[PDB]
Specification:
It comes from Cerebratulus lacteus (Milky ribbon worm). Keywords: Heme, Iron, Metal-binding, Oxygen transport, Transport. Helices cover 61% and strands 0% of the residues. The structure holds protoporphyrin IX containing FE.
C-alpha cells in the first residue's frame, strides 16, 4: 500500500518550512519541525490528514465539511493553494499519485 503517512509527514515539513506561521494554528505550535514526529498533537493531526486522503481516494471524503471547518480557523483559498504545492512535492518524493484533484475539490467550497 502507498505510504500516505510518510507523504503526509513530508507535506507538513514542506508546508511549515514555507509558511511557519501556519503552524501557530495547531496544537503543536512552536515545536521544532524536526521534532514533530515525537509530538502528540502532531501525531493526531497527521493521522487525521492521512485519514482524509484515504477518504478522498475511497470516495467518502466530505470536502464541503473540511472546507467549512478550515474557514472556521480562518484558513482559506490562499492557504490551500500553497498547500497544493507542498503536497505535490511530498507525493512525488514517495512515488505516490498527485492529490491536486482532491485539493481542488476542497477549494471548490472555499
Ligand atoms: C492538503 C491540504 C489540507 C488537508 C488535507 C487538511 C486536512 C485537515 C483535516 C482532516 C483536519 C481535521 C479536521 C477535523 O478534525 O474535522 C484539519 C484540521 C486543521 N487544519 Fe488542515 N488540511 C489542509 C491544509 C491546511 C492548511 C494550509 C492550514 C493552514 C494553517 C490548515 C490548518 C488546519 C487547522 C488549524 C486545523 C485544526 C487543528 C486542530 O484542531 O487543532 N490546514 N486539516
Amino acid at each position: 500500500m502507498v505510504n500516505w503517512a510518510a507523504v503526509v509527514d513530508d507535506f507538513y515539513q514542506e508546508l511549515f518550512k514555507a509558511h511557519p506561521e501556519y503552524q501557530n494554528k495547531f496544537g503543536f505550535k512552536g515545536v521544532a519541525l524536526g521534532s514533530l514526529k515525537g509530538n502528540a498533537a502532531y501525531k493526531t493531526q497527521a493521522g487525521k490528514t492521512v485519514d482524509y486522503i484515504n477518504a478522498a481516494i475511497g470516495g467518502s471524503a466530505d470536502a464541503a465539511g473540511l472546507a467549512s471547518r478550515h474557514k472556521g480557523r480562518n484558513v482559506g483559498s490562499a492557504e490551500f493553494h500553497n498547500a497544493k504545492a507542498c503536497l505535490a512535492k511530498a507525493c512525488s518524493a514517495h512515488g505516490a499519485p498527485d492529490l491536486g484533484w482532491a485539493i481542488d475539490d476542497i477549494l471548490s467550497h472555499l
